[PDB]
Amino acid sequence: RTALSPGVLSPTRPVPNWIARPEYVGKPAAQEGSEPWVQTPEVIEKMRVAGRIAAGALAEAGKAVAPGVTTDELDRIAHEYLVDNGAYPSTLGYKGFPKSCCTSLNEVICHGIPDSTVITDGDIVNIDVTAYIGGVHGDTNATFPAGDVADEHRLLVDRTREATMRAINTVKPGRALSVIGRVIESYANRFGYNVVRDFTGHGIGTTFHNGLVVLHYDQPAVETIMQPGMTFTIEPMINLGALDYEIWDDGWTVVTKDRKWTAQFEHTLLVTDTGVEILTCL
Numbered sequence: 001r002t003a004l005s006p007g008v009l010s011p012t013r014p015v016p017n018w019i020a021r022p023e024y025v026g027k028p029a030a031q032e033g034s035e036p037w038v039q040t041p042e043v044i045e046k047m048r049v050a051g052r053i054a055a056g057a058l059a060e061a062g063k064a065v066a067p068g069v070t071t072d073e074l075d076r077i078a079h080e081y082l083v084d085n086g087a088y089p090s091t092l093g094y095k096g097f098p099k100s101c102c103t104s105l106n107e108v109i110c111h112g113i114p115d116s117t118v119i120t121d122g123d124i125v126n127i128d129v130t131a132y133i134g135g136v137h138g139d140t141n142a143t144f145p146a147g148d149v150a151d152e153h154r155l156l157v158d159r160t161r162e163a164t165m166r167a168i169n170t171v172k173p174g175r176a177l178s179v180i181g182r183v184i185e186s187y188a189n190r191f192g193y194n195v196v197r198d199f200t201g202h203g204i205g206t207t208f209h210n211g212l213v214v215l216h217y218d219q220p221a222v223e224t225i226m227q228p229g230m231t232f233t234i235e236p237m238i239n240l241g242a243l244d245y246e247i248w249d250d251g252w253t254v255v256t257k258d259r260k261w262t263a264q265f266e267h268t269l270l271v272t273d274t275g276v277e278i279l280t281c282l
């Protein structure tokens with residue numbers, strides 16, 4: 001299959017006007033970056049509802065992954081599940097992003113835009129979906145195989161999933177945050193993969209990316225200690241080839257320079273009083 005090129009973007013999907021928009025919608029920037037890392041009990045409970053709903057939207061768009069389907073079509077299914085459940089799609093109008101999820105085929109690392117692109121047999125596609133409901137966000141993504149995927153690509157997907165889950169199972173209060181990126185990177189390196197450094201996980205709460213940064217590679221200079229009530233994502237991008245990338249002129253789509261494929265999984269995590277809870281399960 002040849003290297004991807006930009007497809008054609010369908011017009012802005014509407015969302016019912018009664019659904020509250022995040023503040024950043026239709027503005028050039030978002031007011032985020034300086035919010036508290038530890039959330040209130042109320043915000044946490046609200047994030048469980050946002051997380052469930054984004055998990056539902058993700059599993060529904062993933063069902064439609066099949067040779068012949070377009071990315072635009074995955075967006076539509078995800079959009080429709082968020083809206084039917086009262087959530088705003090956080091990606092929509094975030095810094096000018098035009099769709100309700102990111103769709104990231106094969107050599108696209110992240111931030112791909114749903115479009116006329118038709119999925120072909122053997123492809124892998126990441127769907128990344130975020131829900132905003134009750135003044136809070138819930139963020140989750142996953143890579144789905146399309147028909148008959150080559151063994152090297154199934155293993156990549158399976159091992160990216162496993163890295164992500166291993167990292168999550170280390171989350172506990174009083175443990176250093178740098179532990180996550182140690183675990184992910186050892187695991188990736190074990191099988192010859194390379195972890196994307198330039199994109200990271202993030203704190204998330206009443207804002208989308210609240211200023212907390214979770215590195216997916218080994219960086220022990222970070223002194224952040226996990227505390228009960230902290231909410232963040234773990235979202236590692238793992239490459240078969242080299243880490244160098246380019247961005248499309250749409251300004252969002254990141255693609256591996258060598259055009260080798262790449263995969264990603266994401267959950268939204270709560271640090272509990274003794275451990276972790278995954279907020280983006282069905």
Ligand SMILES: CSSCC[C@H](N)C(=O)O
Nearest residue numbers: 091094097128129130139
């Ligand atoms: C184009 S919206 S910013 C990246 C999308 C994703 N939901 C994330 O931040 O994990």
Ligand SMILES: [Co+2]
Nearest residue numbers: 139202233235
């Ligand atoms: Co995220």
Ligand SMILES: [Co+2]
Nearest residue numbers: 128139140141
């Ligand atoms: Co995401």
